[PDB]
Design a protein around this ligand. Structure first.
Ligand SMILES: [Ca+2]
Ligand SMILES: [Ca+2]
Ligand SMILES: [Ca+2]
Ligand SMILES: [Ca+2]
Ligand SMILES: [Ca+2]
Ligand SMILES: [Ca+2]
Ligand SMILES: [Ca+2]
Ligand SMILES: [Ca+2]
Ligand SMILES: [Ca+2]
Ligand SMILES: [Ca+2]
Ligand SMILES: [Ca+2]
Ligand SMILES: [Ca+2]
Lengths: 44, 129, 123
């Protein structure tokens, strides 16, 4: 999830997708690699 | 007075679909469900209120967004701009997914504020007729 | 010829800053560091790779603005049902382009975001 200025920080799976709900893009910013993003998103 | 499962507001019928589709497929889908259907067009304060509440009834996730009928038709990555120095854009190195020309609403704004999203993602949507 | 603190490549001077400014402020601030300076513009991949490497070796990871702003503000927005676009409720007013010091691909984020930047000038 994005607060006002959180996007300045480097992405982080725990902080953004597990401790918060994350969008497909936030997850992609964490993995960068498409297939990895798919693997994770499909099980999210 | 709409088809079964559709909600009325100002002589228009609306329906929230939980199936995830890209913006384009969602649009086609809407035109095939009802006579004159399209993705919802939020043309007023009241319509926004009604549709936001309508969506809130079916969609509870914050991991996704809900597609609405606004899109930039331009095929180019940016529109009518040059670099801050004056030179035109010859070179480009865009991540396909960073071009966000389709709009959608999210639960964190109560499904009101129009946010920019990459068109080829699959998300729920709302049809209006 | 670049003023020491700046870096040189194919006849242009570049310098990364790590004082977070939004886009408008960054671009503006560039034009003051030296005459004819602006936020960096990319004309080739090597120039791009040159600047990514540069900002990276300097401030490591961060997000850096580039000279592109209000990128879709002038696109042709219209409803699929052809209704009139009068009522609007944009979450963000403008989108600008930036890059991560870890790779050279172009990304987008609201122009109000706070980010590092790189200025560039000629001669
Ligand atoms: Ca966060
Ligand atoms: Ca985030
Ligand atoms: Ca992020
Ligand atoms: Ca934890
Ligand atoms: Ca948090
Ligand atoms: Ca982000
Ligand atoms: Ca991104
Ligand atoms: Ca796989
Ligand atoms: Ca009727
Ligand atoms: Ca409408
Ligand atoms: Ca222009
Ligand atoms: Ca340049």
């Amino acid at each position: 999830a994005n607060s006002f200025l959180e996007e300045v920080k480097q992405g982080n799976l725990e902080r953004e997708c597990l401790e918060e709900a994350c969008s497909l893009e936030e997850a992609r910013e964490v993995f960068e690699d498409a297939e990895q993003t798919d693997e994770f998103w499909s099980k999210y | 007075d709409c088809s079964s499962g559709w909600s009325s507001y100002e002589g228009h019928c609306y329906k929230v679909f939980k199936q995830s589709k890209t913006w384009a497929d969602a649009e086609s889908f809407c035109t095939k469900q009802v006579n004159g259907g399209h993705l919802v067009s939020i043309e007023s304060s009241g319509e926004a209120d009604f549709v936001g509440q309508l969506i809130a009834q079916k969609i509870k996730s914050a991991k996704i967004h809900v597609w609405i009928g606004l899109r930039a038709q331009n095929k180019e990555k940016q529109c009518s701009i040059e670099w801050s120095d004056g030179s035109s854009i010859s070179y480009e190195n865009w991540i396909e997914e960073e071009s966000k020309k389709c709009l959608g609403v999210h639960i964190e704004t109560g499904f009101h504020k129009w946010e920019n999203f990459y068109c080829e993602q699959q998300d729920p949507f709302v049809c209006e007729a | 010829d670049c003023p020491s603190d700046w870096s040189s490549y194919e006849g242009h001077c570049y310098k990364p800053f790590n004082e977070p400014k939004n886009w408008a402020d960054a671009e503006n601030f560039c034009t003051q560091q030296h005459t004819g300076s602006h936020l960096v513009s990319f004309q080739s991949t090597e120039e791009a790779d040159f600047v990514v490497k540069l900002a990276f070796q300097t401030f490591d990871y961060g997000i850096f603005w580039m000279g592109l702003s209000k990128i879709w503000n002038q696109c042709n927005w219209q409803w699929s049902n052809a209704a009139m676009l009068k009522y609007t409720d944009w979450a963000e007013e403008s989108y600008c382009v930036y890059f991560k010091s870890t790779n050279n691909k172009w990304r987008s984020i609201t122009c109000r975001m706070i980010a590092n930047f790189v200025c560039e000038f000629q001669a």
